[PDB]
């Protein structure tokens with residue numbers, strides 16, 4: 683886990699993003715696919731398709747939402763190793779099932795801070811809190827076999 687301090691910083695930077703959940707959740711998903719095109723392949727309707735096709739999809743919102751709703755729960759529990767344990771196991775177990783592994787989260791990690799910053803400048807130290815949090819995610823993926 684993260685320390686309460688770290689956790690606070692991550693929450694603080696997240697607040698503005700989550701404020702506009704629907705629009706921001708969609709933008710995050712699109713930004714990922716733009717920066718890391720290979721990632722669209724892990725999704726049926728999105729593979730073959732262009733970012734423009736994705737943006738136009740009636741499925742976008744359902745996909746990106748689930749992502750934001752879970753991230754929010756990770757942000758909430760970050761400083762409680764216990765909750766994280768369980769959350770991390772279940773998250774990795776689910777992704778590996780789909781063929782997604784840490785390399786994909788290394789990508790998320792890479793572009794995350796920049797994404798948050800495009801919404802509102804984060805507090806000092808928030809960038810490191812997210813990398814740490816994504817770190818926890820990457821490690822869980824590696825333990826789950828990918």
Ligand code: HEM
Pocket residue numbers: 721722724725745748749750752753777780782786787790
């Ligand atoms: C930012 C971190 C991410 C969060 C918190 C997250 C969260 C989620 C959640 C909670 C589900 C289950 C949705 C449901 O209830 O049906 C899910 C499904 C899945 N995720 Fe992630 N995800 C993230 C990153 C990624 C990445 C990077 C990829 C691919 C590169 C990935 C690919 C998938 C796939 C293929 C599914 C299966 C669901 C489907 O077929 O639509 N996710 N993820």
